[PDB]
Structure formats: structure tokens, C-alpha cells
Design an enzyme around this catalytic site. Structure first.
Site, PDB file in Angstrom:
ATOM      1  N   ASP A   1       0.766  -1.070   0.020  1.00 31.81           N
ATOM      2  CA  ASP A   1       0.017  -0.049   0.156  1.00 31.81           C
ATOM      3  C   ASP A   1       0.784   1.257   0.030  1.00 31.81           C
ATOM      4  OD1 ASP A   1       1.026  -0.284   2.676  1.00 31.81           O
ATOM      5  OD2 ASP A   1      -1.133  -0.586   3.450  1.00 31.81           O
TER       6      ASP A   1
ATOM      7  N   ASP B   1       4.449   0.560  13.580  1.00 31.13           N
ATOM      8  CA  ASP B   1       3.538  -0.521  13.585  1.00 31.13           C
ATOM      9  C   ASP B   1       4.491  -1.544  14.420  1.00 31.13           C
ATOM     10  OD1 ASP B   1       1.651   0.620  11.936  1.00 31.13           O
ATOM     11  OD2 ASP B   1       2.478   0.073  10.109  1.00 31.13           O
TER      12      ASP B   1
END
Ligand code: MG
Length: 747
Positions: free
Chosen positions: A38, A445
Site C-alpha cells: 500500500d 507499527d
């Protein structure tokens, strides 16, 4: 002579660390596989080494949005050809997208701009594929677009694109109608040809299209795309994630009540027979037994009544893969409850290629570690090997080479299959001046890692504190074993977790201090920036929400600083432990009392970066004091709208700066070991110097620059982080937003 040849290599994480929303197998050539991300471009599989090769590293500064890969198609007639729909956001954070085409499997690309935006990092990015090649006449391509742009078509092998005005439904579902991210139509969801309705050299006549519209989501043309009708009898209320047509004539479709990748609290699976038109509900779970969408959908090409679907998202205790060998009539689960809370498993997880995927926690039945996965919107069975499976998660690519062990009472061995993938976003980099680690990262993350061998995946996830994202990390220059990282703890999961971590052994082990900044009404949520005094005798924390605080007790207590506006960038002097620097809205500040009080300096000409219209990744501020020289600061950043953009240098503790006239634009500054014969440290910058965008090194205090990257190693919008190595001249560590961390040396 303006360039120096370098060897660019990834700092290895083993798992990749980001979301892989799509894996695409070529339907004709065995072992030809691609993966799309992405924010980090795409990859091609190398069967001989079981690893992935990036096909996106020539994407650069101005065309950065090409690393949002919303769709990918690989040509079944000429497997040398591959195409991508790229563009990262469909809101005001990005410009229009494009269709890219390659005749050499992604080694080189040509691009056709689209008159609208593509959403590689938008909601619904795991639904697909939304770019497909006619399997009978490969000059024909279809693209299902976002934001109400509908169905688009090429008949010249992707060179030019036109809207299919006869397509009747551009979509109605909107994920976040009240936000400024995801308030546009999700649009079309997937496209599937029926190869049997054409012959080689003639356009395929039957085309299925899924649409993000809960009232009517599945459409079909039977005249080669001229007219379209919604499939009669189709189910309503959900959003179809994938539609795959088996050689038996059955169209299988997974549905969720969201487009993902994070939501999905209800779901169905249906099959549609193309001959009879009959719909059959084959949902593995229904009613209160189902609290999740169904996302990934994998058909077995060699055994056409075998298929698998994945939950999206079940969350607890883990996701589920369901397998049927009889066309969906009955399902088997990859794990089952035993005597609660115990579970039984048809799979075994192998994370030896990235041991940090256990997040430093011991696995239990109710909290497995590592989990099977999450955000599993795409699932694949190798069309030339029923034993090979691959699927993306929010953190890696998992796969198996013995899938059919599922059917014979054996155990499916699932392992990390993301070798060569690096997808993290780099918030900070430090290269410690001593000890076995030359690099510690601050990552989104997955927190970040202390690297030793830069080719070996880290073994240790950052814990106590354990959080998703480290926003900032610094160390005490004169006592480098002392270092501090700040992030944002999830205090609903762990109410005692802190958003700051402290190490006294150079980042091997962390502890959480007793308290955090608070303004009497609210304790900080964390993030922001942290700076450590030269001797480690204080910490300065520019929090994300309640302003600037300092500690003289290594975080046991905190006191609000005075004189420095909230949101300021901060940096410590690398020699004087009493000296900190700050910057906010064009004003430079200095503290000479260990961060308690700041005073503005007369330094003029700095950008405010307050410009309206700047995209979130367009402008940067990079400010660092020089190791070993008190009061020596370099400052990079700015933008062209204010006409304040470049590289500044101060040697009087920020009282005044000189703007280097030979640097047109600059966005990051970093330091490394001095060149032989030089006394000043080498400068590493991300900049536009004499019309050339790239990465540059100066061995003479910025008088002359040499480019150390090249057009094949650009890595999109590289305004994230940069540093040299105080022990290795020539070495650069480069952060990215989607390609992890690179390190490079002269060849
Ligand atoms: Mg796929």
C-alpha cells in the site's frame, strides 16, 4: 563526476513489517508471482532463491505516489508484461494516479497519467484485483476505479485509457463519510473474465465486476463490455471482496459488511453457477457464530472444487482460514476449540526468518504468538501447485509448501515468505558510536529494532515498553549506552504501559519509568519527539498533545518547560549537557538550563511550513547538533511556497545560521565519520542540488556535494530519516516511508 557509485542494500527485518494487500499469480507461467503493497511499491518473486525483488525502487521524489499499488495485473499470454494502477490517496493528501506498464516483468516502466486519483493506501485496498488483462486478447485491459470514476478500459495494452460510460454503478458505499480520509466512494471492487467466452485473438465476451454497493454489488457483461446487468438473485447487504470463477463454472464470492482492511464485523460467502444462475449460500459461519467479514478467497486450480476463505477480521483468539474440498458444501477450520480455553491446530507457525514476530511474548491458547495473521484480505493457492499457499497480513507474507497436509490429518507448516521485502516507515535512525550495534531504528507499527548484523533479522521485539510505533529515539552522545524512545502505549489493553522507554545497555533492554508528562487534567498520549542531554543527565520530551516537558530523574518525574511552544521540534547539544535547541513555526530557540526554559534566537529566514495546500509528506524539518562540537547545528527543510527551502548551518548555538547557497532544496541532514585527511564529519543530505534530486554526501563542510544514490535507488518520498555512521566513513543509513531502511557504501 557529480556521482559516486554506491551499493544500496536493505537492512534486513525478515518479515517486511507492512501490509501486503495483494499477491498475484500468473495464470500461465509457473512460479511467476507478484506482490503489491500500500505504500512500498511492488515485488516479483524469485523462485530460485525463495525471495522477493522490488520492482519499484526507481520511483522517486516527485512521482512518489507510484509506490501506492492499488492493483496489479500479470499478462497470461505474454508473461513478460505486467501492469500496475498506482497512486496513494484519493483525498487532498495526493494528486492523480497513473497506470504503469512494463515489458520486462517490472525491471523498467512506462506510465500513463490518469485524470483522477488512485488509492493504494485507501480503504478497500485488499479487494481485487481491480486491474485485469483480457486472457484471450491481451491488448485489452479493464480498471475498476475509486471515488465514483467507475469502470475504465484500455485497448492498446495500457497506453491510453477511456471511461466505460455504459457501466451502470460507480459504487455507493463510503467508509468514513464524516472524516477527511475515506469520505469518497470506495468504487469498484474486482473484475473477473470468463476465459471460456473468448478465443485467442478475440475479446472475451463475459466479464464479471464487483462493486462496493450493499444494494447491488455484482454485475456482468456478456457482450464484451458493451452492456451490463446486475446478476439476478444476488444477495444484498454486504460488500464483495473477491470474485473467483472456477473451471466448474461456479463463481465464488466473499463478502464483508466493510471494505477493510481493519473492519468487518459480519460476512457471507456465496457461489453462483454461471449455467443455471443459481445462488448458494456457502458461508462457513452464520448468525451469532459469525462476527467477521470474509476477505481472502483462494481457489485450487488443480482441484477445482477445493477453495479457502479467511476471516476479516475475527481478531480473537486469532483469524480463521476455512477450507472446503467439495465446492463449499462443508468446511474445515485451520484451528478448532478443544476443551476451552485449549485449542487444536492444523498448522504450525515458523517465524525463524523473523523471530521478533512473537513480539517478545510467550504464546498461549487465548493470546497466540505469533498469530496466524490479521488483515487477511487476500489468500492464494499456487495454480500450478496445490501444496503452495501464500497470504498477506498487516505485517508480513506467510506461506506453506505442504498445504494438502490439511486434508490427510497432517499439519500445514506455515512460514515467513517475505524474504527481500522491506515495507516499514522509518520515523528515526541512530547509529551508535560504540558497541556491537551500528543502527537502531524507530519504526511505525513494529516499533523498531537494534540491529547487529544488518543482514540478519532482529531476534528481539522492543518490549517494556511494547507499543506499535516509536516516533522518536535519541541517545546520550557522551554516555551512548543511555538512550530513550517515545511512542504511544495502548493503555486500554495495558493500563500500566508507558509511552516512553529507557535503556542503559545501548537498546538491548528497556524499562518504563514511573511517570509521564501531565498537565493536571490529562496525561500525554505520547509520540512527539525526544532528545537526550549529552551526558544523559536529562530528557526533553516534546509531546504530541500537551507540549514540552523535561525530566532530571530519567522519567521518574516530569516538569513543563517554559518558553517553547507546544509541537516544537527539539534537539540536544551533543557536548554541553545543559544545552537544548527548539524550533517552531520559523522561530529557533535555545535552552541553557537543561530544558527548563527556552529563549528565541534572532535566527531569521527559516520556513514556517504553515503553508496551506502542503500534503502531509511534502515538507520536513531536520535539525541536529554535531557530535563533538558544542553549538554546531545543521538545519534542513522548508518548501517552495514560502521560498524558504534548503540547508542552514550555525556554529554559535543557533544565534544565527548561514543558508548554504549551493543547496537549492534540502529535507534531511545527517552526519558520519570524517573522510581521510578531513577533520569535519561527512554530511549526508536528502536534497535537490544543481537540479538533481537524490542523496548527497559532503566531505568538506558542505562546500561540495556528490550524489551517492542513483535513478534506480530513489525509494519515493525519502524525507523520513538519514544518518551516517560515526565509525564507518562513506556509510549512509536512509529511512523511507514504505521501503524500510537502506544502508549503502561505495561499491
Ligand atoms: Mg490476490
Amino acid at each position: 563526476g557529480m556521482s559516486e557509485p554506491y551499493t544500496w542494500k536493505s537492512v534486513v527485518t525478515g518479515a517486511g513489517g507492512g501490509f501486503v494487500p495483494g499477491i498475484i499469480f500468473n495464470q500461465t507461467e509457473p512460479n511467476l508471482i507478484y506482490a503489491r503493497t500500500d505504500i512500498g511499491g511492488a515485488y516479483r518473486w524469485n523462485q530460485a532463491t525463495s525471495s522477493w525483488v522490488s520492482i519499484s525502487d526507481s520511483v522517486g521524489w516527485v512521482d512518489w505516489n507510484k509506490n501506492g499499488v492499488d492493483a496489479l495485473a500479470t499478462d497470461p499470454i505474454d508473461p513478460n508484461k505486467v501492469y500496475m494502477a498506482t497512486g496513494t490517496y484519493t483525498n487532498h493528501w495526493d494528486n492523480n494516479g497513473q497506470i504503469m506498464r512494463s515489458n520486462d516483468r517490472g525491471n523498467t516502466w512506462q506510465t500513463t497519467p490518469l485524470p483522477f486519483k488512485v488509492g493504494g493506501n485507501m480503504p478497500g485496498r485488499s479487494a481485487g484485483e481491480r486491474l485485469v488483462i483480457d486472457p484471450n486478447k491481451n491488448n485489452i485491459l479493464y480498471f475498476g476505479a475509486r471515488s465514483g470514476n467507475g469502470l475504465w478500459k484500455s485497448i492498446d495494452s495500457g497506453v491510453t485509457w477511456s471511461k466505460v460510460t455504459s457501466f451502470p454503478n460507480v459504487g455507493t458505499y463510503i467508509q468514513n463519510p464524516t472524516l477527511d480520509y475515506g469520505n469518497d466512494l470506495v468504487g469498484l471492487s474486482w473484475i473477473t473474465f470468463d476465459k471460456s467466452t473468448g478465443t485467442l485473438g478475440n475479446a472475451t465476451q463475459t466479464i464479471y465486476v464487483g462493486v462496493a454497493d450493499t444494494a447491488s454489488s455484482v454485475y456482468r457483461s456478456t457482450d464484451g463490455g458493451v452492456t451490463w446487468t446486475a446478476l439476478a438473485g444476488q444477495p444484498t447487504g454486504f460488500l464483495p471482496h473477491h470474485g473467483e470463477l472456477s473451471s466448474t463454472g461456479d463463481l465464488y464470492i466473499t463478502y464483508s459488511n466493510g471494505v477493510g482492511p481493519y473492519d468487518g464485523s459480519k460476512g457471507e460467502v456465496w457461489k453462483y453457477n454461471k449455467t443455471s444462475g443459481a445462488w448458494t449460500n456457502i458461508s462457513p459461519t452464520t448468525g451469532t457464530d459469525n462476527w467477521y467479514g470474509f476477505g481472502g478467497l483462494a481457489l485450487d486450480a488443480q482441484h477445482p472444487n477445493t477453495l479457502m476463505v479467511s476471516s476479516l477480521n475475527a481478531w480473537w483468539p486469532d483469524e480463521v482460514i476455512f477450507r472446503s474440498t467439495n465446492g463449499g458444501a462443508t468446511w474445515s477450520r485451520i484451528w478448532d476449540w478443544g476443551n476451552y480455553p485449549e485449542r487444536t491446530y492444523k498448522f504450525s507457525m515458523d517465524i525463524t526468518a523473523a523471530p521478533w514476530l512473537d513480539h517478545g511474548t510467550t504464546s498461549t491458547s487465548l493470546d497466540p504468538s505469533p498469530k496466524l495473521g490479521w488483515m487477511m484480505g487476500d489468500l492464494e493457492i499456487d495454480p500450478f501447485n496445490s501444496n503452495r499457499m501464500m497470504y498477506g497480513t498487516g505485517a508480513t507474507i506467510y506461506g506453506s509448501n505442504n498445504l494438502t497436509s490439511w486434508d490427510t490429518g497432517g499439519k500445514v507448516n506455515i512460514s515467513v515468505m517475505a524474504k527481500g521485502v522491506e515495507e516499514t516507515a522509518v520515523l528515526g535512525l541512530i547509529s551508535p558510536p560504540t558497541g556491537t550495534s551500528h543502527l537502531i531504528t524507530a519504526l511505525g507499527d513494529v516499533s523498531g529494532f537494534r540491529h547487529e548484523d544488518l543482514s540478519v533479522a532482529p531476534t528481539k521485539f522492543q518490549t517494556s515498553p511494547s507499543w506499535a510505533t516509536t516516533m522518536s529515539i535519541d541517545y546520550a552522545e557522551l554516555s551512548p549506552s543511555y538512550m530513550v524512545r517515545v511512542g504511544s502505549a495502548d493503555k486500554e489493553k495495558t493500563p500500566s504501559m508507558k509511552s516512553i522507554g529507557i535503556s542503559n545497555d545501548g537498546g538491548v533492554n528497556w524499562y518504563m519509568p514511573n511517570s509521564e508528562p501531565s498537565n493536571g487534567t490529562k496525561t500525554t498520549v505520547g509520540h512527539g519527539q525526544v532528545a537526550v542531554s549529552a551526558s544523559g543527565n536529562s530528557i526533553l520530551w516534546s509531546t504530541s498533545d500537551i507540549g514540552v516537558y523535561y525530566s532530571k530523574t530519567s522519567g521518574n518525574s516530569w516538569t513543563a518547560s517554559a518558553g517553547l511552544p507546544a509541537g516544537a521540534k527539539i534537539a540536544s547539544d551533543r557536548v554541553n549537557p545543559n544545552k537544548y535547541y527548539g524550533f517552531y513555526a520559523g522561530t529557533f530557540y535555545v535552552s541553557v538550563d537543561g530544558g527548563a526554559t527556552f529563549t528565541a534566537t534572532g535566527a531569521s529566514g527559516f520556513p514556517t511550513n504553515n503553508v496551506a495546500g502542503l500534503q502531509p509528506n511534502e515538507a520536513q524539518i531536520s535539525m541536529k547538533a554535531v557530535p563533538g562540537i558544542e553549538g554546531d547545528i545543521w538545519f534542513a527543510g522548508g518548501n517552495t511556497v514560502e521560498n524558504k527551502y534548503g540547508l542552514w548551518h550555525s556554529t554559535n548555538s543557533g544565534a544565527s545560521f548561514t543558508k548554504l547557497t549551493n543547496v537549492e532544496e534540502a529535507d534531511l541532514i545527517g552526519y558520519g565519520k570524517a573522510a581521510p585527511g578531513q577533520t569535519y564529519m561527512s554530511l549526508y543530505t536528502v536534497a535537490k542540488i544543481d537540479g538533481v534530486r537524490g542523496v548527497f554526501r559532503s566531505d568538506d563542510v558542505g562546500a561540495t556535494w556528490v550524489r551517492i544514490n542513483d535513478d534506480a535507488h530513489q525509494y519515493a518520498k525519502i524525507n523520513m530519516a538519514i544518518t551516517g555512521d560515526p565509525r564507518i566513513y562513506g556509510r549512509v543509513y536512509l529511512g523511507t516511508n514504505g521501503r524500510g531502511t537502506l544502508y549503502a557504501d561505495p561499491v
